[PDB]
Design an enzyme around this catalytic site. Structure first.
Site, PDB file in Angstrom:
ATOM      1  N   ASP A 107       0.824  -1.205   0.000  1.00  7.55           N
ATOM      2  CA  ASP A 107       0.000   0.000   0.000  1.00  7.55           C
ATOM      3  C   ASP A 107       0.861   1.258   0.000  1.00  7.55           C
ATOM      4  O   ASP A 107       2.060   1.221   0.302  1.00  7.55           O
ATOM      5  CB  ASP A 107      -0.955   0.010   1.209  1.00  7.55           C
ATOM      6  CG  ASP A 107      -2.140   0.975   1.029  1.00  7.55           C
ATOM      7  OD1 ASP A 107      -2.835   0.887  -0.008  1.00  7.55           O
ATOM      8  OD2 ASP A 107      -2.393   1.812   1.928  1.00  7.55           O
ATOM      9  N   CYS A 164     -32.177 -10.994   3.069  1.00  2.81           N
ATOM     10  CA  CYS A 164     -33.569 -10.569   2.992  1.00  2.81           C
ATOM     11  C   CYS A 164     -33.929  -9.412   3.919  1.00  2.81           C
ATOM     12  O   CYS A 164     -35.071  -8.953   3.937  1.00  2.81           O
ATOM     13  CB  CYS A 164     -34.474 -11.767   3.280  1.00  2.81           C
ATOM     14  SG  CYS A 164     -33.836 -12.868   4.580  1.00  2.81           S
TER      15      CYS A 164
HETATM   16  N1  LIG Z   1      -1.623  -9.430   3.065  1.00  2.00           N
HETATM   17  C1  LIG Z   1      -0.836  -8.367   3.340  1.00  2.00           C
HETATM   18  N2  LIG Z   1       0.506  -8.387   3.099  1.00  2.00           N
HETATM   19  C2  LIG Z   1       1.314  -7.320   3.373  1.00  2.00           C
HETATM   20  N3  LIG Z   1       0.826  -6.165   3.907  1.00  2.00           N
HETATM   21  C3  LIG Z   1      -0.506  -6.018   4.200  1.00  2.00           C
HETATM   22  C4  LIG Z   1      -1.430  -7.136   3.929  1.00  2.00           C
HETATM   23  N4  LIG Z   1      -2.651  -6.731   4.302  1.00  2.00           N
HETATM   24  C5  LIG Z   1      -2.539  -5.468   4.778  1.00  2.00           C
HETATM   25  N5  LIG Z   1      -1.259  -5.042   4.715  1.00  2.00           N
HETATM   26  C6  LIG Z   1      -0.705  -3.714   5.128  1.00  2.00           C
HETATM   27  O1  LIG Z   1      -0.616  -3.608   6.544  1.00  2.00           O
HETATM   28  C7  LIG Z   1      -0.362  -2.218   6.817  1.00  2.00           C
HETATM   29  C8  LIG Z   1      -0.795  -1.803   8.228  1.00  2.00           C
HETATM   30  O2  LIG Z   1      -2.224  -1.679   8.259  1.00  2.00           O
HETATM   31  P1  LIG Z   1      -2.978  -0.308   8.685  1.00  2.00           P
HETATM   32  O3  LIG Z   1      -4.355  -0.660   9.118  1.00  2.00           O
HETATM   33  O4  LIG Z   1      -2.044   0.403   9.633  1.00  2.00           O
HETATM   34  O5  LIG Z   1      -2.909   0.572   7.309  1.00  2.00           O
HETATM   35  P2  LIG Z   1      -4.058   1.088   6.286  1.00  2.00           P
HETATM   36  O6  LIG Z   1      -4.951  -0.053   5.846  1.00  2.00           O
HETATM   37  O7  LIG Z   1      -3.296   1.890   5.258  1.00  2.00           O
HETATM   38  O8  LIG Z   1      -4.926   2.127   7.173  1.00  2.00           O
HETATM   39  P3  LIG Z   1      -6.497   2.493   6.926  1.00  2.00           P
HETATM   40  O9  LIG Z   1      -7.280   1.215   7.022  1.00  2.00           O
HETATM   41  O10 LIG Z   1      -6.897   3.522   7.967  1.00  2.00           O
HETATM   42  O11 LIG Z   1      -6.531   3.099   5.535  1.00  2.00           O
HETATM   43  C9  LIG Z   1      -1.063  -1.428   5.709  1.00  2.00           C
HETATM   44  O12 LIG Z   1      -0.165  -0.482   5.092  1.00  2.00           O
HETATM   45  C10 LIG Z   1      -1.598  -2.537   4.777  1.00  2.00           C
HETATM   46  O13 LIG Z   1      -1.619  -2.236   3.387  1.00  2.00           O
HETATM   47 MG   LIG Z   2      -4.907   2.332   2.844  1.00  4.62          MG
END
Ligand SMILES: Nc1ncnc2c1ncn2[C@@H]1O[C@H](COP(=O)(O)OP(=O)(O)OP(=O)(O)O)[C@@H](O)[C@H]1O
Ligand SMILES: [Mg+2]
Ligand SMILES: [Ca+2]
Ligand SMILES: [Ca+2]
Ligand SMILES: [Ca+2]
Ligand SMILES: [Ca+2]
Ligand SMILES: [Mg+2]
EC number: 6.2.1.45
Lengths: 76, 986
Positions: B452, B580
């Site tokens: 991300d 439903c």
């Molecule tokens: N399967 C995965 N493998 C690697 N990283 C992951 C996976 N799933 C989620 N992440 C990452 O874990 C990180 C920590 O999660 P966090 O909730 O802090 O971030 P976020 O989703 O960017 O925040 P928000 O939900 O407020 O937008 C995020 O940057 C997210 O993209």
């Molecule tokens: Mg995000």
């Protein structure tokens, strides 16, 4: 006797149990009040998590004792 | 007023009214070492009026053991002035200044005062004033594996929210004149005795729906009493209650009088008898200080310990504390006195930080009043801990070495970690690792991954990032950001953008893992945690888990061949409403919102995709009827989005938008009321529309109604976005085409499916133009995006939700709530993230120490909202006996090379004493002693890998290094037994 189960959400639950009662038997009394399947229940007493198969006495849980009902979080 | 683009997340845990108090609260922080800086970091990101620092002292090299804002060359300069420059860079909305003088009167400028690294004598002087003038006072200190927090918010502090939870609510079925309220159908109210509730929509007793709260007396899980109310009616029917959170005043004792009768907040009921001891020791630490010119006991020194111990007996009597001093325990605080761990600072930091917010918002129950914590289990036992090993070295790791020793410091440095996730927890984790000097050594190496990018809202909990970083990868940016905190990490950290899971198994393969020391999760979803868990168990690698939810957070350690894995226990799934209930019988605003979201996806996403898929996949049409659940919906989505209703002007889109209105807020409603008359009854002669079913009401359009208009605008604009047409904003434009609209009459048909053709469908697919006619043409699908406003995404859903809300007489909700629920946002903030990270690292050191006793590890569980902390030993992996030998149902496995079937068989029988009766891979049966002598004779000589490919009829993939197999056999008694899996290392 009577024990108290405080949860992470600040809720207190009172139970009527016996020292010889089994943990499985306790989880159920909790399921009847809160509706939480025994599988998802995480009861901790004095730094030890309770496990099915054992009994309240095996954990030295005595009268008026307090336990915690916690959960794991998904957020990160 | 409040920046919702940044404080988005944090607002769901604190609330607006709560933050408006913060923006008008000035905070002062005495001390700028690991603890002080951590506290500030959070308070800054929090959103207070401003932060003020005060720390004249220089910058000893040892300070860099937890002060991530002090570099190698800042030595000498006053920590206050040196850090203020970076803390200011955190939150723009919050200014950060410094002060060189400590004036008693000066304090009345701040709403809360934090005190770190200060002698008791000086503390009193400060509290005495603060307390009298009603000024929030907080004192905390990090001494090695020991810590302590004190709170004093005045003898008349008032709290307006004691738990943070959302005011309970629930539908009623009835209510006697005695006050016996009965919940709906098997619905739980979850009320506690002593709770207050108001009512609404209760027939039979109108005067009850006024609002005046009423004390509750729980009679069971489905019923509660409110006292006699026969003077308001004889019997009420189906209504709705709402809990009223009643404030309460908390009287705090002065540090002086409380020092006498201290009120402890036990963080671990297992160490129940330790807080008192610590209450003494911590004061003794103060006395000793003055005696030796403000210096604390030397690391693991015995002489200082002996003297320290005396000071204990000194204040033990003067305080008249009738207790049995624990020499061994207390002396431990003396040895670790100079200890300055970053984990301890992260823990006590996020904790204290939350307290400051409480004092400035009157939200959440404060710590009242002594919080003495210790993680003594962390103390290493695989290395020699003596006055010698814990001696300073002149490096930035003295604060740590003082506790674990130089010898241990090496292990930490040579670690090969793998951090999965780079979000909130991710940053804090890296930060802690930097200060601890992880992967600093030679064989050391950190690997951070995340797919991300940085977003505005992320800069609230993830400090390693800055606004100018938005759009950049997290793993990559965080990596660089860490190299600046501790340069010794440059070239020691590798970042990745791969999403951990089955696909990424290409990068994170066997070779990648066989090198890792341990793995740490910083994920946000259960599915991912599960995946990692599985892998770690297969590669027999340790794993550190942690999660957060607002003020709540949890920690879990899973050590190989010792504890159970993460997925060994179960968690409650995601609460999804009945198909439903959202489709026809919604009763809660959450229902319409979920509906609104499917509407969004159903009008601007699903259909578009079918259009593009039709212009890409050749046999798409054919393969649809063969797979697609609703082949009709598919064929129609194309017909209508390509020709039947393809717009050519925003004006022609507004017509489409207006049509939808009647299609989902009028006609659909009419059709329902047709199948289920507004007063029809069931077989039990009961009103069909009673309780869980609210009788709807078709809505007639109205060009001059916020909701009605907002919908048309949103809907139209979005439809445009699909075909690429300039969307307008000028209201006059809509009227000029809407005022002159004539909707085709609607009559509810007979015989429609409402839950509680072979030629037609196939003929319509012929009315469509062949892909050939529109080569290279494509449409723009709308990808839902909660964090934005220039997309009309949330604007649509809110309106669509509030419009269906009117249909079923349901109370609407602003786009703030709608966004929260529609986007399924996870409320959270910096405080919790820090606490977990600390606890996590406090365990990390237990793994590098190689502790084999399970009673030494701890799983964390906490809720800052109520100052609740609890830990518990980890559950042991389920064992099992096979041939008398004890085996691990989770970790033990049989490691064999790519030998021959005959060989493997002989092995188990000669080396394991097991008669392999059945061998398999996945769903394929490779061997079985009950097979014909033919099948066997032709396979026995083959090599496992060969046998697999043959039976599978699908040759293996060359990127594999391992190969898992399951077996069935008999013990030495010939009786079937269950044995571990087999891992063929080919
Ligand atoms: N399967 C995965 N493998 C690697 N990283 C992951 C996976 N799933 C989620 N992440 C990452 O874990 C990180 C920590 O999660 P966090 O909730 O802090 O971030 P976020 O989703 O960017 O925040 P928000 O939900 O407020 O937008 C995020 O940057 C997210 O993209
Ligand atoms: Mg995000
Ligand atoms: Ca409650
Ligand atoms: Ca047209
Ligand atoms: Ca073993
Ligand atoms: Ca065996
Ligand atoms: Mg997330």
């Amino acid at each position: 006797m009577q024990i108290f189960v405080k949860t992470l959400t600040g809720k207190t639950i009172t139970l009527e149990v016996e020292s010889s009662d089994t943990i499985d038997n306790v989880k159920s009394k909790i399921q009847d009040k809160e509706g939480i399947p025994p599988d998802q229940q995480r009861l901790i007493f004095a730094g030890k998590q309770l496990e099915d198969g054992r009994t309240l006495s095996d954990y030295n849980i005595q009268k008026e004792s307090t336990l915690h009902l916690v959960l794991r979080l998904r957020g990160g | 007023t409040i920046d919702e683009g940044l404080y988005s997340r944090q607002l769901y845990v604190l609330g607006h009214e709560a933050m408006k108090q913060m923006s008008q609260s000035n905070v002062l922080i005495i001390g700028c070492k690991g603890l002080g800086v951590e506290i500030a970091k959070n308070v800054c990101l929090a959103g207070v009026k401003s932060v003020t620092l005060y720390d004249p002292q220089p910058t000893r090299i040892e300070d860099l053991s937890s002060q991530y804002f002090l570099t190698e060359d800042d030595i000498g300069v006053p920590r206050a002035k040196v850090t203020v420059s970076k803390l200011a860079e955190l939150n723009q909305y919050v200014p950060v200044s410094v002060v060189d003088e400590l004036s008693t009167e000066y304090l009345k400028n701040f709403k809360c005062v934090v005190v770190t690294e200060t002698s008791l004598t000086k503390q009193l002087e400060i509290n005495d004033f603060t307390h009298k003038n009603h000024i929030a006072y907080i004192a905390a200190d990090s001494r090695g594996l020991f810590g302590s927090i004190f709170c004093d918010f005045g003898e008349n502090f008032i709290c307006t929210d004691t738990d943070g939870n959302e005011p309970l609510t629930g539908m009623i079925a009835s209510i006697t004149d005695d006050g016996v309220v009965t919940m709906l159908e098997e619905t739980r109210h979850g009320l506690e005795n002593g709770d207050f509730v108001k009512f609404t929509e209760v027939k039979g007793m109108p005067g009850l729906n006024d609002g005046t709260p009423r004390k509750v007396e729980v009679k069971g899980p489905y019923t509660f009493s409110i006292g006699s109310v026969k003077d308001l009616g004889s019997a009420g029917y189906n209504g709705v209650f709402t809990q009223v959170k009643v404030p309460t005043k908390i009287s705090f004792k002065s540090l002086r009088e409380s020092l006498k009768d201290p009120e402890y907040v036990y963080p671990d009921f297992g160490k129940m008898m330790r807080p008192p001891q610590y209450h003494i020791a911590f004061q003794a630490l103060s006395a000793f200080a003055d005696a030796h010119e403000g210096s604390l006991p030397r690391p693991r020194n015995d002489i200082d310990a002996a003297e320290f111990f005396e000071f204990c007996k000194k204040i033990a009597s003067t305080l008249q504390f009738d207790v049995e001093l624990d020499e061994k325990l207390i002396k431990e605080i003396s040895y670790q006195a100079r200890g300055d761990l970053v984990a301890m600072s992260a823990f006590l930091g996020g904790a204290v930080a939350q307290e400051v917010l409480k004092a400035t918002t009157s939200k959440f129950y404060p710590l009242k009043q002594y919080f003495y914590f210790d993680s003594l289990e962390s103390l290493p036992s695989s290395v020699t801990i003596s006055e010698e090993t814990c001696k300073p070295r002149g490096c930035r790791y003295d604060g740590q070495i003082a506790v674990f020793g130089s010898e241990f410091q090496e292990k930490i440095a040579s670690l090969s970690t793998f951090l999965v996730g780079a979000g909130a927890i991710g940053c804090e984790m890296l930060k802690n690792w930097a200060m601890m000097g992880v992967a600093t050594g030679e064989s050391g190496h950190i690997s951070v991954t995340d797919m991300d990018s940085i977003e505005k809202s992320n800069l609230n909990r993830q400090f390693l990032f800055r606004p100018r970083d938005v759009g950049k990868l997290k793993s990559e940016c965080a990596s660089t950001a860490v190299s600046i905190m501790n340069p010794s990490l440059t070239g020691k950290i590798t970042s990745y953008q791969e999403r951990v899971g089955p696909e990424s198994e290409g990068i994170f393969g066997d070779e990648f893992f066989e090198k890792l020391s341990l793995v740490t999760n910083a994920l946000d979803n259960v599915e991912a945690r599960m995946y990692v868990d599985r892998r770690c168990v297969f590669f027999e690698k340790p794993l550190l888990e942690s999660g957060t939810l607002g003020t709540k957070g949890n920690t879990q350690v899973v050590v190989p061949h010792l504890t159970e894995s993460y997925g060994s226990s179960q968690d409650p799934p995601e609460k999804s409403f009945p198909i439903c209930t959202l489709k026809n019988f919604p009763n809660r605003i959450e229902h319409t919102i979920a509906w609104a979201r499917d509407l969004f996806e159903g009008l601007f996403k699903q259909p578009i995709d079918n259009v593009n898929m039709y212009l890409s996949s050749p046999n798409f049409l054919e393969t649809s009827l063969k797979t697609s659940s609703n082949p009709r919906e598919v064929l129609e989505n194309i017909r209508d989005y390509l020709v039947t209703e393809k717009p050519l002007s925003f004006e022609e889109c507004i017509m489409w938008a207006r049509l939808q209105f009647d299609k989902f807020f009028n006609n659909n409603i009419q059709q329902l009321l047709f199948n289920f008359p507004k007063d029809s009854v069931t077989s039990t002669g009961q009103p069909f529309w009673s309780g869980p079913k609210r009788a709807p009401t078709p809505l007639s359009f109205d060009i001059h109604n916020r909701e009605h208009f907002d919908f048309i605008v949103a809907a139209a604009s979005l439809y445009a976005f699909n075909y690429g047409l300039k969307s307008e904003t000028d209201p006059a434009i809509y009227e000029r085409v809407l005022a002159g609209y004539n909707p085709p009459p609607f009559a509810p048909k007979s015989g429609i499916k409402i839950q509680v053709d072979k030629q037609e469908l196939k003929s319509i697919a012929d009315s469509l133009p062949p892909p050939s006619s529109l080569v290279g043409f494509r449409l723009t699908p709308a990808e839902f995006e909660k964090d934005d406003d220039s997309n009309h995404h949330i604007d649509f859903i809110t309106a669509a939700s509030n419009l269906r809300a009117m249909n079923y007489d349901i109370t609407p909700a602003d786009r703030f709530k709608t966004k929260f629920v529609a986007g399924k946002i996870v409320p959270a903030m910096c405080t919790s993230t820090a606490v977990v990270s600390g606890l996590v690292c406090l365990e990390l050191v237990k793994l590098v120490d190689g502790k084999k006793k399970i009673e030494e590890y701890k799983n964390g569980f906490f809720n800052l909202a109520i100052g609740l902390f609890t830990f518990s030993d980890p559950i042991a992996s389920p064992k099992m006996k096979v041939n008398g030998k004890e085996i691990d149902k989770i970790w033990d496995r049989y490691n064999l090379p790519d030998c021959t079937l005959q060989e493997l068989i002989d092995y188990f029988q000669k080396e394991e004493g097991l008669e392999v009766t059945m061998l398999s891979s996945g769903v394929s049966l490779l061997y079985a002693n009950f097979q014909p002598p033919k099948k066997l004779a032709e396979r026995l000589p083959l090599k496992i890998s060969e046998l697999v490919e043959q039976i599978t009829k699908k040759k293996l993939e060359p990127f594999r290094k391992h190969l898992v197999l399951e077996i069935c056999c008999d013990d030495a008694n010939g009786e079937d037994v269950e044995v571990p899996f087999i891992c063929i290392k080919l």
